[PDB]
RNA sequence: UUGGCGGAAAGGCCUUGGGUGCUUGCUGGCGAAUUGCAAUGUCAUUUUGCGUGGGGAUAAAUCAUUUGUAUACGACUUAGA
RNA sequence: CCUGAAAAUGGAUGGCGCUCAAGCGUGUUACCUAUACUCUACCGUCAGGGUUGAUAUGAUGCCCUGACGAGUAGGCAGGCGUGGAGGUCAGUGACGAAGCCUAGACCGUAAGGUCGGGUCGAACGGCCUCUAGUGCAGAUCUUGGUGGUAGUAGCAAAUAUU
RNA sequence: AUACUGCCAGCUGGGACUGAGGACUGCGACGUAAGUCAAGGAUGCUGGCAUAAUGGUUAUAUGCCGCCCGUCUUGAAACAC
RNA sequence: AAAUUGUUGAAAGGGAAGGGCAUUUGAUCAGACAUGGUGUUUUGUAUU
């Protein structure tokens, strides 16, 4: 959601030219971050390994208002509220390993070739 | 049949060579074409200059930078003919045009390798004696190619080195013949001759 | 010594086609060294393999094969028609196929 | 151990999808014949979707056969297995989606007793 | 219910085949395949190797041997379509070949359960191979360079066009 | 290890010498089976890593400030331990 | 072949290109490939037939067949679905009905039918018939809901705020 | 004698596609005998696997194709609705 | 439920996208191997 917004020098940190400073949204997000940090502290989590593992804002029921237009017309003036949810998780390394075996299937000729190689090599 | 076929472009009619090379590239053969400045076109030099000026007249009216790009080097002219002979807007055509490489003169990778000809494209074999023809280098410099003389100088230097190499190779072959003539006409040679070698 | 090739080299040129429609069920094969239908008549009925490699192992090999056969000649210039148990993947127009010498009749 | 029958041939294994069902969401995939005057699909222009035709009909000797060669038979109970009890080689039972767990296991046990093949003997139980 | 019963019912018996009129007739081999001839094995473990053709077996197969002492190809059978007949011929007179046949090449196929997930030669076979090979060698050595020709493995070279080659 | 030569896109060519391995140039000795009658029957490549060793030095850009030879905004000439 | 032969965006023997042609006239021949022709398999339609047998078959049942198959407007026929109704399955179901989701499966040329897995919460279906407010992609259709445009136009009259 | 035409119920090969049908039935051929057969539709032998290998679905890539439906209209992709 | 969104996952993307035939690649998945037949060195001993 950036079309026809102005450019800034502070988008180079992120490779883009269009970046902004949404004060109200940032305040809401950091308030929810504070709440999640409180929940994690109550749960007994690390508070230093914590990273935002999930964040999701989606549209809420619009709040309707009216605007008035030339020649006696009425158009909509809608708020576009958001549901914001987020989950912080303690960081961890790549625990997973030891992938599936994928048992092999050889024919008689393949088995004979493997046996012959095993005999020839020492 | 071969990994790369390198074609001496000298004396070759541009259209016949382009048709041959396009068929080969689509068939999957890597081709490098050297001496593009010595390619021939049938007909008078003035005629092919008029043809290139007709080509030059065509350009996108509202923006000449979107229009046809009239390339001037002889290698680029040969490439344009071949790209016209290839279905270049499909991935197969792009793969063939990637298989093709064309140069003016003979760059260092290819001056040390064998160069072949396409007799069904060679002007001396195809054109009737007494028919006029032009040279791609002469046409290119007439229409704006800037390196007729740099290429000619590098070509003279390369031909000098190659002639020295050929003299050395002749000397080695002749000395091999002189030394192994004593071992020639032997019983093994007679048996090979009877067998057909 | 250094040569173990027991087949003739060939190129997969295209599918059997008209100007504007192709038939993937028949492939056109050029046999290297062969330039006449008279000389290509030797290879009629000979088996052909398109051998390619995948990054995933299937049954102990990373190499897969698609078999086929030379069915008839095509044109006046030594190209032949070939039919494969699976149609050639159409990215192999100009790829190398191996025309084996069997079923042999010499 | 099975009846030698002709190899089951499907003339058109692809699904006949309605024209522009990919273009628009309001158009479902259920086949509808184009009745339009200018329709390329109705006019059978080259490069367009095929339309269902009676020439695609399956061989009468192999029609309705499962991949195993049985003709599938919706059953709801043991009385529903009783019809197949003698035709183990040509019919396979399919337990109705509506059958509860205990009735399903009863049907499965009776079909195992009579040798009847069931085309879904894994529903409503975990792997 | 959904389908109580169909009034018309199928039959239970399995059909018997019609009396086919395809009688098996002995195979006719090409004129270039006579016993005692040198063949190039075109496929198999021993592809490209030059062997000696000994006898036409009953199951349309050709009994061949290297000889084993010469190139390591044992007393096997090969498919006559997977070999190339060469004009080179050894005098097959002096070696008895009547012992070998399909029952001689009996294998006792392994069972399905015996699966070599990760992981010998009969004495009568090895001794009769020795006898056949000694007779074949005594014949072969009469022609110069033939033993080394049989030791060499055939290959196609750059420019080797088999449609013009004479074997 | 010794001369180089090669700038068109040089990235390739011998040699000067010491060491080692094969040599089918001509003659021998042993081995090969069973992959079972074929199944490409597997043999060459723009990248990396908790890793191992023959060795090497510890840089900038950007934001913020500033600038006005620039400038709608970005960009652009500049400055700042 | 040339002159005669002048029109406006750049430009079209289809393009590249072709000159003892890859041009023009002519003459053998080889080769390429249509849903055409020949021959096979299968589908359906039409037609001409066979078939009374002690049980294990509701005789257009089973079978032998030969030919044929384009289609708007239009006609006719066989079917597929929907809401209700009469019979029946002493049919399915709170041990989960109906709905809904599912680049899972099978069947049918198709309309569509059946099933696997999730969601859930009280009814529903097969068959023979009856009945109709019975099937939607459009009607600047109706009523609701929702988009891209778009974080865009813009929120600049009435001196002005610190 | 060779051409060149025509005929052969003349011989010898090399390839490809297909294998419908399924409890005796027919017409024929083979020294005119019981039997056989290439005679009213493929059998015989052999190997590998028994699995995602074949195949289905699905997404993509590639080759060649493919203009937006409905409508009125002689004619619609239409710069017609 | 759909339109329409957010996140994650998987994929393609040189002036559209979508589609048909055919294959390939990656995912995913259904189809005899308990059986109207022979028989056995006992898996855990109306027979396995």
UniProtKB/Swiss-Prot annotation, chain A:
The modification Phosphothreonine is found at residue 8. One of its GO terms (cellular component) is cytosol. The keyword Ribonucleoprotein applies. Keywords: Cytoplasm, Isopeptide bond, Phosphoprotein, Ribonucleoprotein, Ribosomal protein, Ubl conjugation. GO terms for molecular function: structural constituent of ribosome. It comes from the Eukaryota. Its main location: cytoplasm. Coiled coil: none annotated. GO terms for biological process: cleavage in ITS2 between 5.8S rRNA and LSU-rRNA of tricistronic rRNA transcript (SSU-rRNA, 5.8S rRNA, LSU-rRNA); cytoplasmic translation. It is found in: Cytoplasm. The keyword Ribosomal protein applies. There are 2 genes for uL22 in yeast. Belongs to the universal ribosomal protein uL22 family. Component of the large ribosomal subunit (LSU). Mature yeast ribosomes consist of a small (40S) and a large (60S) subunit. The 40S small subunit contains 1 molecule of ribosomal RNA (18S rRNA) and 33 different proteins (encoded by 57 genes). The large 60S subunit contains 3 rRNA molecules (25S, 5.8S and 5S rRNA) and 46 different proteins (encoded by 81 genes). uL22 is associated with the polypeptide exit tunnel. This is Large ribosomal subunit protein uL22A. It comes from Saccharomyces cerevisiae (strain ATCC 204508 / S288c).
From Swiss-Prot, chain B:
GO terms for biological process: cytoplasmic translation; maturation of LSU-rRNA; negative regulation of translation. InterPro entries: Ribosomal_uL13, Ribosomal_uL13_CS, Ribosomal_uL13_euk/arc, Ribosomal_uL13_sf. There is a cross-link at residue 175 (Glycyl lysine isopeptide (Lys-Gly) (interchain with G-Cter in ubiquitin)). One of its GO terms (molecular function) is RNA binding. GO terms for cellular component: cytosol; cytosolic large ribosomal subunit; nucleolus; ribosome. It is found in: Cytoplasm. Gene3D superfamilies: 1.20.5.4280, Ribosomal protein L13. Pfam families: Ribosomal_L13. PROSITE patterns: RIBOSOMAL_L13. N-terminally acetylated by acetyltransferase NatA. Keywords: Acetylation, Cytoplasm, Isopeptide bond, Ribonucleoprotein, Ribosomal protein, Ubl conjugation. Component of the large ribosomal subunit (LSU). Mature yeast ribosomes consist of a small (40S) and a large (60S) subunit. The 40S small subunit contains 1 molecule of ribosomal RNA (18S rRNA) and 33 different proteins (encoded by 57 genes). The large 60S subunit contains 3 rRNA molecules (25S, 5.8S and 5S rRNA) and 46 different proteins (encoded by 81 genes). HAMAP family: Ribosomal_uL13 (MF_01366). Belongs to the universal ribosomal protein uL13 family. Present with 43300 molecules/cell in log phase SD medium. PANTHER family: LARGE RIBOSOMAL SUBUNIT PROTEIN UL13, RIBOSOMAL PROTEIN L13. This is Large ribosomal subunit protein uL13A. It comes from Saccharomyces cerevisiae (strain ATCC 204508 / S288c) (Baker's yeast). The gene is RPL16A.
Curated annotation (Swiss-Prot), chain C:
The lineage of its organism: Eukaryota, Fungi, Dikarya, Ascomycota, Saccharomycotina. Keywords: Acetylation, Cytoplasm, Isopeptide bond, Ribonucleoprotein, Ribosomal protein, Ubl conjugation. Component of the ribosome, a large ribonucleoprotein complex responsible for the synthesis of proteins in the cell. The small ribosomal subunit (SSU) binds messenger RNAs (mRNAs) and translates the encoded message by selecting cognate aminoacyl-transfer RNA (tRNA) molecules. The large subunit (LSU) contains the ribosomal catalytic site termed the peptidyl transferase center (PTC), which catalyzes the formation of peptide bonds, thereby polymerizing the amino acids delivered by tRNAs into a polypeptide chain. One of its GO terms (cellular component) is cytosol. N-terminally acetylated by acetyltransferase NatA. It is found in: Cytoplasm. The modification N-acetylalanine is found at residue 1. There are 2 genes for eL33 in yeast. This is Large ribosomal subunit protein eL33A. Component of the large ribosomal subunit (LSU). Mature yeast ribosomes consist of a small (40S) and a large (60S) subunit. The 40S small subunit contains 1 molecule of ribosomal RNA (18S rRNA) and 33 different proteins (encoded by 57 genes). The large 60S subunit contains 3 rRNA molecules (25S, 5.8S and 5S rRNA) and 46 different proteins (encoded by 81 genes). There is a cross-link at residue 46 (Glycyl lysine isopeptide (Lys-Gly) (interchain with G-Cter in ubiquitin)). The keyword Ribonucleoprotein applies. The gene is RPL33A.
UniProtKB/Swiss-Prot annotation, chain E:
PROSITE patterns: RIBOSOMAL_L6E. One of its GO terms (biological process) is ribosomal large subunit assembly. It is found in: Cytoplasm. Keywords: Cytoplasm, Isopeptide bond, Phosphoprotein, Ribonucleoprotein, Ribosomal protein, Ubl conjugation. It holds the Pfam family Ribosomal_L6e. The keyword Plastid does not apply. The modification Phosphoserine is found at residue 11. Disulfide bonds: none annotated. Component of the large ribosomal subunit (LSU). Mature yeast ribosomes consist of a small (40S) and a large (60S) subunit. The 40S small subunit contains 1 molecule of ribosomal RNA (18S rRNA) and 33 different proteins (encoded by 57 genes). The large 60S subunit contains 3 rRNA molecules (25S, 5.8S and 5S rRNA) and 46 different proteins (encoded by 81 genes). One of its GO terms (molecular function) is RNA binding. This is Large ribosomal subunit protein eL6B. The keyword Ubl conjugation applies. Component of the ribosome, a large ribonucleoprotein complex responsible for the synthesis of proteins in the cell. The small ribosomal subunit (SSU) binds messenger RNAs (mRNAs) and translates the encoded message by selecting cognate aminoacyl-transfer RNA (tRNA) molecules. The large subunit (LSU) contains the ribosomal catalytic site termed the peptidyl transferase center (PTC), which catalyzes the formation of peptide bonds, thereby polymerizing the amino acids delivered by tRNAs into a polypeptide chain. Present with 38400 molecules/cell in log phase SD medium. Residues 1-21 are annotated as: Disordered. One of its GO terms (cellular component) is cytosol. PANTHER family: 60S RIBOSOMAL PROTEIN L6, LARGE RIBOSOMAL SUBUNIT PROTEIN EL6.
